[PDB]
Symmetry: C2
Subunit: 828 residues, 2 copies
């Protein structure tokens, strides 16, 4: 190939009875005609290919007032919609193209709306009726800096637009390009001008190469193609719908009449563009004709293909013309013909050219070695197609296109609750649709995660198969700094992490590393596999603190590593009791070794204390509980200040029963806690000095995150945090959690996540004040976690869904485009 071959990496279209590429394929393949009588709500030649309507547009989506929309050429409105759908089809998040060198090249040859406006003024009319802004408005909305132009070569406009885009890319003038065109038939005045010229079929059909050939039927619509160099496309890993090998445009020069096509100039166009691509008559599998069904122009076009691609070829060359389905879109005829060729190439199947029974007797199909495609066959030999588009004033263009070289979240977003619903519904319908079933739920989720703008109204549906996800969608259609609070003793439960281990590799890997180290530590000095204890439902070994502490630590670090791989990075950490060890380790204060030595030792040295220890949860202020226990310091103290009217009293089972009795006796909530010992009381004084010696043998570094102390109730700095005195005091004195929450809020935490099992700490954070428990109870752990990271994402946290799918080998696949909230905008 002479010059950089160019990649079609996406496309959009509104055409008669074909609102998008999928519908277009349906129509062509079914051999269906979208030509109808003029709809009654249009004005009046009594036949045409019309859009279901041209009056509706989501002005708000594109930051346009209802008055500006009303003054705006529906062509300008449609090409905005097509621009957005072209980029989404290609998988490019349009915000990533802001301030880049994206080119916009549009064929537009008709200003009907300007005709209506002027046959009957505010500041809006200038921009709304000026043709230049069919391209310029796309460029302004995407903030693109590439060249932005409208080209008028009559009925060849939209393919010349593609050419200028290919050349722009080849020269490095633009790095990506939107190219195509638009033609909306909305004024009678333009219908009468083409009628009086004599060119319209009285039957309202393009009898392309058929002998009934007597003129064209009008059509309306628009198309765009997303263009990158083939090089840049492959490199960036883009879906390649086909590749433009060569484009050319010439003019008839000295035609018989100004408006007669010249066989000579067509041959010259064809000889050049194919030679430039290096494609012999035999390598071309199909040609998408101009084929308007005119008496003069059909034979001349047949002739020209017969001279250049007829001679030098065994089999006849299949030809056809989308004008037989949707009519002559004029300015946007060429991009119509190209988008068909592209669908044929991706599907690897041909489709009928309608209105063909008896060949034109001025077109020897046998001699010229052309047969008209009349059947929806498959396409034999890669595959290569030519597209022709000719303007009445002589300027001809041809393009040569080749074929290309456990629990899942689906994320959906929109600019509006009503859009989010419509968005959710459109994905559900498509997921169940055949075309949606040629894509895996894995590929779909990854594509939703990486290839779609995250608009300000967002939902995550979860599910294990297509049916569960679709059902979740149908149901849907009906910040600050991120703070982590690490769960302590009480938050533990039999099974802890089994469901997460089977589900997420990243949890499993880290849970192995943490258990491997702990099995060695506890194997040496036991209170030998921590994993078996944790994952077994038939075991109460966890309620014993020499297992409880290491278990909470193992679950919490594995969980934190899973959250971290999802881009849920804590900026501030705190922990209730043993919670603090996980918090401190993931803040990088202790190596895994030292962390495991520390938590195991703590667990064991406390385990080997006698019974006679108890704790009770009490609905009472710190001030009340100080008054009640003052003088009993040696037997009992405050174990935790968890809320402003929530403290845990800890010590002698005797004196703890008494305190439970008192507060119950005052008609207050008093819940006896299931613990082996009186944690954070004088009963811990025996193991302290032994604990001090273990922490003395550990290396404490400065943390990578802000740590808030459960001892201090405040941001704790490294000099204090990296001392032996701190950790012994931590083991002994009251967990000032409620104060820790205030200190976190004080420092700018706006979102709180409980890292650990259940929601004990999440409740206490609610009491003190966006709070989410990473793994709430009475549901599968994967469910309750995805649910939790789902709220974070909806609340506005930038969860990295891309990195949820590094596990699977997920591939980008095409999706439904944005569900525009269209409303009527028009003159009066």
């Amino acid at each position: 190939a002479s010059d950089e071959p160019i990649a079609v990496i996406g496309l959009s279209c509104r055409l008669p009875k074909a609102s998008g590429p999928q519908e277009l394929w349906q129509l062509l393949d079914d051999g269906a005609s979208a030509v109808t009588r003029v709809p009654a709500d249009r004005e009046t030649a009594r036949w045409g290919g019309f859009l279901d309507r041209v009056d509706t547009f989501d002005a708000g989506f594109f930051g346009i007032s209802p008055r500006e929309a009303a003054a705006m050429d529906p062509q300008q409105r449609l090409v905005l919609e097509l621009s957005w759908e072209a980029l989404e089809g290609a998988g490019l998040v349009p915000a990533t193209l802001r301030d880049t060198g994206l080119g916009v090249f549009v064929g537009a040859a008709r200003d009907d709306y300007a005709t209506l406006y002027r046959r009957r003024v505010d500041h809006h009319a200038m921009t709304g009726l000026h043709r230049s802004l069919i391209a310029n408005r796309i460029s302004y909305a995407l903030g693109a800096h590439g060249p932005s132009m409208v080209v008028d070569t009559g009925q060849s406009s939209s393919l010349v637009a593609v050419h200028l885009a290919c050349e722009s890319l080849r020269r490095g003038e633009s790095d990506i390009a939107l190219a195509g065109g638009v033609n909306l038939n909305i004024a009678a005045e333009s219908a009468r001008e083409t009628a009086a010229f004599g060119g319209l079929s009285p039957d309202g059909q393009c009898f392309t190469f058929d002998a009934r050939a007597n003129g064209f039927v009008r059509g309306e619509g628009g198309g765009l193609v997303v263009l990158k160099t083939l090089r840049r496309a492959l490199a960036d890993g883009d879906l390649v719908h086909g590749v433009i090998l060569a484009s050319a445009v010439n003019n008839d020069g000295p035609s018989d009449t100004l408006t007669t096509p010249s066989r000579r100039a067509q041959e010259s166009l064809l000889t050049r563009v194919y030679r430039r691509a290096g494609v012999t008559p035999t390598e071309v599998g199909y040609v998408e004709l101009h084929g308007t069904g005119t008496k003069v122009g059909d034979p001349i076009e047949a002739a020209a293909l017969g001279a250049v691609l007829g001679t030098g070829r065994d089999t006849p060359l299949p030809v056809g013309s989308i004008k037989t389905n949707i009519g002559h879109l004029e300015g946007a005829a060429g991009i119509a013909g190209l988008i068909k060729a592209l669908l044929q190439l991706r599907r690897r199947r041909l489709v009928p050219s309608l209105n063909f029974s008896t060949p034109n007797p001025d077109i020897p199909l046998d001699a010229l070695n052309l047969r008209v495609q009349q059947e929806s066959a498959p396409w034999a030999t890669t595959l290569v197609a030519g597209v022709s588009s000719f303007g009445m004033g002589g300027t001809n263009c041809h393009v040569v296109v080749s074929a290309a070289p456990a629990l899942l979240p689906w994320v959906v977003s929109a600019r509006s609750p009503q859009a989010l619903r419509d968005q959710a519904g459109r994905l559900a319908a498509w997921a169940d649709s055949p075309a949606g079933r040629e894509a895996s739920p894995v590929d779909i989720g990854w594509s939703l995660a990486t290839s779609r703008t995250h608009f300000e109204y967002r939902a995550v549906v979860s599910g294990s198969d297509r049916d569960e996800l679709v059902a979740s969608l149908r149901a849907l259609a009906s910040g600050g700094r991120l703070g982590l609070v690490f769960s302590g003793q009480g938050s533990q439960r039999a099974g802890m992490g089994r469901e997460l281990y089977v589900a997420f590799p990243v949890f499993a890997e880290a849970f192995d590393e943490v258990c491997g180290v702990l099995d060695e530590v506890m194997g040496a000095l036991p209170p030998g596999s921590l994993r078996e204890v944790m994952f077994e439902v038939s075991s109460d070994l966890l309620d014993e603190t020499g297992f409880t502490q290491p278990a909470l630590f193992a679950f919490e670090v594995a969980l934190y590593r899973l959250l971290e791989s999802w881009g849920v990075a804590g900026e501030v950490v705190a922990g209730h009791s043993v919670g603090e060890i996980a918090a401190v380790h993931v803040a990088g204060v202790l190596s895994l070794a030292d962390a495991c030595a520390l938590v195991a030792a703590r667990g064991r040295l406390m385990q080997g204390l006698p019974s006679g220890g108890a704790m009770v949860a009490v609905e009472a202020s710190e001030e009340e509980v100080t008054a009640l226990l003052a003088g009993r310091e040696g037997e009992v103290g405050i174990g935790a200040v968890n809320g402003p009217r929530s403290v845990v009293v800890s010590g002698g089972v005797a004196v703890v029963e008494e305190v439970a009795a008192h507060f119950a006796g005052l008609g207050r909530r008093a819940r006896r806690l299931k613990v082996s010992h009186a944690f954070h009381s004088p009963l811990m004084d025996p193991m302290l000095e032994d604990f001090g010696r273990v922490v003395a043998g550990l290396s404490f570094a400065v943390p990578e995150l802000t740590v808030v102390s459960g001892l201090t109730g405040a941001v704790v700095s490294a000099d204090e945090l990296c001392s032996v005195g701190y950790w012994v005091r931590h083991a002994r004195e009251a967990v000032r959690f409620a104060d820790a929450v205030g200190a976190m809020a004080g420092v700018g935490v706006g979102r709180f996540v409980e890292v650990g099992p259940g929601g004990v700490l999440s409740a206490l954070v609610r009491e003190c004040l966006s709070v989410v428990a990473a793994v709430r109870g009475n549901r599968a752990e994967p469910v309750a976690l995805l649910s939790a990271v789902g709220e974070l994402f909806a609340d506005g946290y930038p969860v990295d869904w891309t990195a949820y799918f590094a596990g699977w080998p997920a591939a980008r696949v095409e999706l439904p485009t944005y569900a525009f909230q269209r409303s009527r905008h028009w003159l009066e």
Copy 2:
């Protein structure tokens, strides 16, 4: 320079009070404003730059009916006129561009005429009101095959058109390009649309960079530039008006408003285009601004030039804006700005930007290092200029242009007598105009000869200086096969060829070669310099036949060589008597040597016969003169049958006097001839056998032309012509000239030229039947010859005027363009 630098090899423009490049220079240099109130014959913002009119066009010139012209956008009409004037300005004969790859690229952003037509239908409206044909109609009229497109980028359209043309040329897509644009303000409806947007100055002036800046005043017009690669231009030897080093177009991307310009995107456009050209802030001598005189847009444009070309520069950068003279041409603003820059570059002088007194207080001219040109200075240091053009919808374009690296005939032609007059007058006025006086009469003639279509109504004016030629013009404003007949004895006159020898080198050179050989031949066997005898007025030596024959031969061959160098190539030749020797020699039958031996011998061998010989011209039929002389064969015969009632009787002076007496006695014309002897009579029998021996020693080849015999009266073939018998018989028997003329006509001669002095033979050709005597009498030989080759050219002979000027070192120079016969064409 990065890519092929591009040569501006010509240009045209209609602008307010500037009907062409010369008038435009007048206006800018005089610091004059063409802004006026809306002319009364237009409709209604009450201010603008308007053309004297938009309603007049030479439809016939371009093969368009008055009804098609009436349906045609004046924009389509004006760009046709500009296309033709652009090519003529460049010196290209438009017929030479037929079937070539000439590109047409036009900025057009307004369809006013389509607005008028539709606010009030035949087949003509479609093509007449469709914008595409602003370009396509140029392509159809010139029969060009290059890409042909209209581009709409709003107020940057016409400069983007230039860009796309430069890129087209660089890629080899086109080999020459017409680029520019057009904007005609003819509907009130478009005036109201821009008015309501708020952008128009209430004073009707662009106060460009001045503090009165309050909006733009509208303008109308069009411009084109002729573009070749610099390589191809120099090679083909084309007038180079300037060279585009680099062009660029980008878009604002995310501007404040859709219609706010971005300083950023302007800087990026400027940094790129100059870097691509390699031109530092200091090498740019002048910048032609967009400079619309808007409050928002002036500072932003100033700013952008100050960042890229301000910093890195000693002297302030001169800026200006043609919008201060003619208003904002919008679509055609850019080609207006470029054509100014080009004139500044060729003239090597700057011109004022009008409407500047007090700098805008948002434009620090000192800081940005920009001064506004307010004076018509000269341009110091080659010279390099930038042009900016910005569209309201963001698409900006900039172009970097550098300065370039005795008797005469003036030929004039037109499609009409009335055009030929108008054409002749326009060249006269221009010849006397200062601009015409910077070109020599030599350069002018050569340019008229080589750089202008030869239309079907043609005149040649002759003269020795500018005054004589201009006078000839003012006076003007108030075929078949070509046959040559070579003069014989009688046609000779004292001075023969002196006037032609001094005038035309090609005559002189050949007359030397022929005289050199003859001086040797006659020097040996004299009857010694033939030139002295011929050129002397005080000599009757020529009336003696040993000089008469060689003299006629010398003059005739020199003359034939002069005619031949002018592309006046005989296809058929005949000669009266000695005439035949010249005819036969130039037909290549005899070498110069053998021809000179033959004619000298003939002259001498006849000279040495006695007196007693006479000839008389007689008004009588051959039949009458046969009856009168029958029986007197030995004393007298017919010397010539010259017409049907014109014979020459030859023999004894006695019997010749008798015959003169008889016919005079019958009241008939009888003119006694001045000859030494009775040529073509029995008195020649003595020298015959001696003549036969001379011709026997000569080499006769087959002729390169058809020869018709004065002996035979018929086409003579080589076997007869290349025999000794023929030439002796030729010396003896009657010159059957009248029959020779019939045989020439019979074989398809439609134009007859007497090669020799006077018009004796031309009269006899008139008698027998387009007849012209190459050198008629009683006038300077150069005059009577140029006069003669003038008629041939006017009658339709393809005289090679180019080859009249090989003598001088003539250079192509710019000329007035075609004097269009404009008439009113409009709707009702």
